[PDB]
Design a protein around this nucleic acid. Sequence first.
RNA 1: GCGAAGAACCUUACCUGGUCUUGACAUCCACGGAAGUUUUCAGAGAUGAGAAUGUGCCUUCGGGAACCGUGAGACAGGUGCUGCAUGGCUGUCGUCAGCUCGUGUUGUGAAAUGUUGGGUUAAGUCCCGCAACGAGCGCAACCCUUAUCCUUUGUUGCCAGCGGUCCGGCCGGGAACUCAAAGGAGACUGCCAGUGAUAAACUGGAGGAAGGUGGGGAUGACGUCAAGUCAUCAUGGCCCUUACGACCAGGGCUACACACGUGCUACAAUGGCGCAUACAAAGAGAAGCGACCUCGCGAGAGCAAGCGGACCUCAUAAAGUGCGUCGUAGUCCGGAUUGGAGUCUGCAACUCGACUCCAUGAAGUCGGAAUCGCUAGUAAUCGUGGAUCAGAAUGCCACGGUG
Lengths: 98, 206, 79, 100
Amino acid sequence: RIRIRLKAFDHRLIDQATAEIVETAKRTGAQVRGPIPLPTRKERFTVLISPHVNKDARDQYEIRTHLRLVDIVEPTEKTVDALMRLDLAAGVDVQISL
Amino acid sequence: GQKVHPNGIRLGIVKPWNSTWFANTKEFADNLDSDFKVRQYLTKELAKASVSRIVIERPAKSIRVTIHTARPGIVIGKKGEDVEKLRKVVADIAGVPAQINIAEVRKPELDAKLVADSITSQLERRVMFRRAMKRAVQNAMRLGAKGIKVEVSGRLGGAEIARTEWYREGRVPLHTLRADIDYNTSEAHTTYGVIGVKVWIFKGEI
Amino acid sequence: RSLKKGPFIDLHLLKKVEKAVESGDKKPLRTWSRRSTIFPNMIGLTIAVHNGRQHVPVFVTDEMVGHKLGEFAPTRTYR
Amino acid sequence: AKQSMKAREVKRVALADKYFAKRAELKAIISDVNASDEDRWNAVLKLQTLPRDSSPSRQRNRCRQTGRPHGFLRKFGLSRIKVREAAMRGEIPGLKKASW
RNA sequence: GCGAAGAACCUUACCUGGUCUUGACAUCCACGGAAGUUUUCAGAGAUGAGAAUGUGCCUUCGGGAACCGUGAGACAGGUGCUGCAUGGCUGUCGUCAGCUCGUGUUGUGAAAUGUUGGGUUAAGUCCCGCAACGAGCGCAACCCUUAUCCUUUGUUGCCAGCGGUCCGGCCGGGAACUCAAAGGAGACUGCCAGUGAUAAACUGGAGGAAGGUGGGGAUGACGUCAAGUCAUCAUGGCCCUUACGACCAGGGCUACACACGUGCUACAAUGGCGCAUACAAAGAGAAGCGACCUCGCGAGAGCAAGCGGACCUCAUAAAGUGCGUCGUAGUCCGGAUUGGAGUCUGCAACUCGACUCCAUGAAGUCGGAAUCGCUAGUAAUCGUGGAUCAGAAUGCCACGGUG
């Protein structure tokens, strides 16, 4: 039995991406819990601080990834077609768990 | 040196960007070549319009243009529907529906693009360059500003050589990164010289 | 010690060492591959090895088991 | 960009499309083991000294907007400053910086 | 121990000889050929050319021109010389405290006065008084952030409260808390006491998670210096242009008959060693982190997981603690061998890689005229992880324990 996940690099694009898989089924199945937020994680990243030739110093680069399980549970063949049409969308990533 | 390129590297600092567009990196040079092409056919239907700058945004399946004008009537034409020509000159190049917004310039005698025009059109009429230069500053510094500089080049006052001379009032932070300087270079292109003016305006940080 | 437990001879060197016994019909034959390894099959012959500007002869000793051709060819003028 | 680097790119990508035969890729499968002890060869590599510089080495994708290798970030294809400048404009797919 | 954060051929500016000279990139003139792929001979190779497989595109495949050969002829090419041609890029005194506009007063004037004097500070900084005042800039403030509550989240994380209940996050569930965020709060010498000129400022006191501008960043006031860089570069001159261009390999540049500043470690027994072992932060990951079991004296290779990154996998941190044993002994001190075996990646592990097993045991009995660093989560000490990439650094980047 399938489960599906959604990832995004912005706290707001993820909600208008949920609109293509959860609110496309608002009339086409049972109710779905308001999205559980999950941790955004630390996963610290770093870059060389000056545009050229400085190498003694390195800066922090603050970025986080959002992860949602969307509470939608097992999909119909129509919700799979709606999910595979979101796999064709740029700037986000969808994943399937078996 | 230490004059740099104000319309280049400095223009992305404390200012809104004049272009925003995404493309596949395998066609980035062709979509950069069209970022100029959508301006090339447009700045000819603004030739009288006293426009300080234009902004061209290319979201997915869309293109949205803002024009910052000192004269909002001359861009909308008879019955105010002739503004659609500014869409039709770029939509015929991009092949997608185009949007137009006309924005008003606050104090058009304090905007660098337009102050350099108001000096060039006086140098074309052979006025004494210091009179036009000092009147441009005494006007702008009374409309606002924290300081202003003007530099005039070419045939100064009837001179037998090209030359360069300047005038400055107040503070003009050219070595400060957050200064929000407003800049333009203009040229008169005559039978007897190129006759140029450069202006730097400072009104407040960030 | 070898490489991967076996002796090996590539075509560029095989075409030189199967022409020599003992003494050939002409001078010792020329090679530049100083990164090549010499094995007990090459025993008893003379070959001419490059130094970077000229070539010098070397003879394969009866006590040969595994050496690089660049190690025993007289190359470095020292003092 | 220098023709000397472009000519080595045009060699490096062409040595990755020189051979297609199952003997020219024998070093992907012949060092494979299931059991130890004793030698297997001594010289089975009969058509594998003929290749030159065809093995995967020194492969690059660089800063995809400028062609420069300097200071580019693998996760974006952009320079370590262009990753802010393009996100301040909203151009990077799914990523934004300031005022959102 | 620094030029431009990994060096075998690579990169590379050197030397010897190759393989080329409208060059690879480009505009273009003629003529015979489509172009690629496959393979044999010759060379180690850059290549010299056949033979097979083939005749695409536009067109009427009459013809045309990419493209290939061959010739002609303007040329193409260069991290070559030069910041002593420039621009850009930044570097420095320096977070230093000082620089201007409208002005007053004084002198013939350079210029002064003010900005001097009394108190004081991080500071021409804040005050007191005074022949000086307003207005600006830098400083501070502003902007970024951390030490801790409050509200919002509530999952496969956490589990206190609550009904079950070997009483276990386990079930029902909960939001109490660590966790991962976004906001709202908190710090201002501000409140209190002293000194002082009940000024400013400074030392104490309380409060709190904590100040004594809370600490560290961001800077580019007026200016200094013809600093570095043609090396991402762009580009005016110079130089080389069948070459100083380039492209294949060999010698190498990790060299050695000279001279040294500056590195880094052992020379135990308030302990070591063997055995049993406690408590982390910051990290890496489905083209990855790499397990179990098998084999090898081991590197590693087999068979091939687990996990979606809390839990799996890297990886039971060490110093320390306890017991037994040891006893200034060249020790259980200390550390290079010469021989032999391997394990792995690759045009190549000779000189000169990584990684591993067996033995040799040299030096060292604590270091010369002399000399070095930090005033508290600090010195020292004991440990930990990672990127780059075919393979390859206790260098380079970072953190916790004891303190």
